[PDB]
Design a protein around this ligand. Structure first.
Ligand SMILES: NCc1ccc(-c2ccccc2)nc1
Ligand code: NA
Lengths: 305, 305
C-alpha cells in the first residue's frame, strides 16, 4: 500500500552527467555515446543574454573553447554543432556508461523524474510534471541548467527535458533533447511570462482512482455527470478541460475499481465545491495532479482493496 | 527557486540490489563486499510466518537453498549467518560496485531516501521520514521486501533502513542494516498496530523556513513565544516536543531569514490554532514534517554528491 511521489532510479542518468564550461559560464551536460548535450546559452557572455545571436556566437568558437569534465577526466571536444536551443559537443570518448536511451517530446500533463545536478555531479532526484502552461515546478538553483528530465520504462531511459532557465514566477522552462523549447519561451533573458496555470484534470481523476485502490472512498457520491457539464464546472476552478481521450485513458482504472469515469468526475465536481472538510486523500489536503493514469497503474496494485 | 521533496541519487545503491530466492519466496537483497543482506523471513514459508523459530529453520536451510541473482548472472553462496532480523549470505564474489558505505541507525524525525525494488530490480526512489511512531509511510507492493533506505553525506552512503513488512494501516516497518527493528514490531504474521503518529515539530519549522526562503511569508507575525508555552500548544495538537537542541539545529536558518525559532513557533502556533485560512505554503495545504533542517539547507544551497 501507500502512495508516494516516486521518481525513477537515477543511476542510468548519473553516469551520463558531465560539466560543460565555456568562458566563465559553467553548467551541466548530458553525455550519451560520443555526444555531449547542453543548453546553447553556455556560449553567451554577460551582455549576450537579452538578444544573443547564437549562430554568430557559435561560429567564433573552436573545439578547445569547450571544457568538458566527466568527474576528473577531461573530455576532448572534436566537433560541435547546434540543434535548435541545445549544443551537441562531439567528444573523443564514447560514454561507457551510456544506457539504452532515446529522445521523446512529452505533452502537458506528462510526468518525469528530474536529476538536479550542479558542476556535473548529481544533487538530488525528484518527480515533475509538464504543466499545461508548458513550465515545470522544479527545484533548480544557479548552475542547474543542463539537468535533464527522464522516464525509465523497462530498461530504456527516455530523455524528455533539459533545464534552461527560470521564469520570474519561480517556475522553470526547458527544451526536449532536440533543442525545441516546451511552450512559447525562448532562451533569452528578456522578461517572459508563463501562461495562467491550470490543473491537470485527467491526472487528478487518476489520483482519485489511486485513492480507491488503496482503500479510501469517502469522496465518492451517488451522482454522475455528462462530460460537458463536468468541464463547465471544472474550468471555473482553473482545471484543464477533460476530453474523450482522457475518458478513454481512465478506462482501465475505471474497470479495476468499478467506478465509471463520469462517476469519478461527479465526485471531483463535489470535491471542488466542498473541499475535503478537514480530511485528506492519500495524505494530502490538496487535489494532486502530478500522477498520470500510467503512473497510477505502475505504482498501484492490480487488485483493489 | 522551487522546493521539492528530493531524494538522494540512487546510483551508488542501485549497483548493490540483487534478487534473493529461498523456496518460493523471492525478495531483494543488498550486495556489499562479498555478503548479501536480506530480511531473515525469506526462509519462512507462509506457514512458518505465524510463529517462526528462525534459528530452527535456518539450520535446515543451507547455502544452495539461497538463489542470489545479480542482474542476470548467478551468485554462488558459500556461507550464511544471521544477525538479529537480517540474513547475511556470504557469496563467492565481492561486489565490484560496492561504494563507500556505512551502517547507521537513524532517530525518529530523520529523513532518508528509499530505493523500492522488485525481483532485485530497482523501480522507484522517494524520500521518507522515520515517523515518531517508528513506522514509515512508504509506497511498497509485493516483492519490495529488502528495499533499503539510505543517505549520502559526501561520497559515503549510510544505509539506515531495510524493508520487512507492511502494517494493516498501510504504513511500513523495517530494520536497520544490522537487523534491529525500528519500533515495537516483530517479523511474524501477528496482530501488530502502528502507534498514534505525531508530527515532527522541528521538521515543520525547517519547512517553514524553506517557505520563507522561497518568498512565502504570509504566515509570519510580529509575535514570539517561549519554549515552555509552545510545547503546551505542541502537546495539544499532537506535535513532538521542541527541545533546545532542535532550536540550535535551526540556528543557521534563523540567521539566514532573520526569524527566530521561537518567533517561527509563534507563526506555527497561530497556524495550529487558526489553520492556513485558505492559503497554501510551498504548494501544500498541510504542514509538511518530512524536511529536516539539513534537508532544507542542502536543497537551498545545491550540495551535490
Ligand atoms: N516583454 C519582453 C519580451 C520580449 C520578447 C518575448 C518573446 C517571446 C517569445 C518569442 C519571441 C519573443 N517575450 C517577451
Ligand atoms: Na512570527
Amino acid at each position: 500500500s501507500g502512495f508516494r511521489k516516486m521518481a525513477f532510479p537515477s543511476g542510468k542518468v548519473e553516469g551520463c552527467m558531465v560539466q560543460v564550461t565555456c568562458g566563465t559560464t559553467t553548467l551541466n551536460g548530458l553525455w550519451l555515446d560520443d555526444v555531449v548535450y547542453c543548453p546553447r546559452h553556455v556560449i553567451c557572455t554577460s551582455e549576450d543574454m537579452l538578444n544573443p545571436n547564437y549562430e554568430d556566437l557559435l561560429i567564433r568558437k573552436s573545439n578547445h573553447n569547450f571544457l568538458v569534465q566527466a568527474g576528473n577526466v577531461q573530455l576532448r571536444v572534436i566537433g560541435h554543432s547546434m540543434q535548435n536551443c541545445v549544443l551537441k559537443l562531439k567528444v573523443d570518448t564514447a560514454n561507457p556508461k551510456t544506457p539504452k536511451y532515446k529522445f521523446v517530446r512529452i505533452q502537458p500533463g506528462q510526468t518525469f523524474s528530474v536529476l538536479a545536478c550542479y558542476n556535473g555531479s548529481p544533487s538530488g532526484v525528484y518527480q515533475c510534471a509538464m504543466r499545461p502552461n508548458f513550465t515545470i515546478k522544479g527545484s533548480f538553483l544557479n548552475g542547474s541548467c543542463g539537468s535533464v528530465g527522464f522516464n525509465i520504462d523497462y530498461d530504456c531511459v527516455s530523455f524528455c527535458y533539459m533545464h534552461h532557465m527560470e521564469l520570474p514566477t519561480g517556475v522553470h522552462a526547458g527544451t526536449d533533447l532536440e533543442g525545441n523549447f516546451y511552450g512559447p519561451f525562448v532562451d533569452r533573458q528578456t522578461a517572459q511570462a508563463a501562461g495562467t496555470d491550470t490543473t491537470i484534470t485527467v491526472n487528478v481523476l487518476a489520483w482519485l482512482y489511486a485513492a480507491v485502490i488503496n482503500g479510501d472512498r469517502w469522496f465518492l457520491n451517488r451522482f454522475t455527470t455528462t462530460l460537458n457539464d463536468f468541464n463547465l464546472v471544472a474550468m471555473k476552478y482553473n482545471y484543464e478541460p477533460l476530453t474523450q481521450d482522457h475518458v478513454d485513458i481512465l478506462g482501465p482504472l475505471s474497470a479495476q475499481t468499478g467506478i465509471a469515469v463520469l462517476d469519478m468526475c461527479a465526485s471531483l465536481k463535489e470535491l471542488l465545491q466542498n473541499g475535503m472538510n478537514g480530511r485528506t486523500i492519500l495524505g494530502s489536503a490538496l487535489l494532486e495532479d502530478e500522477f498520470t493514469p500510467f503512473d497510477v497503474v505502475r505504482q498501484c496494485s492490480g487488485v483493489t482493496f
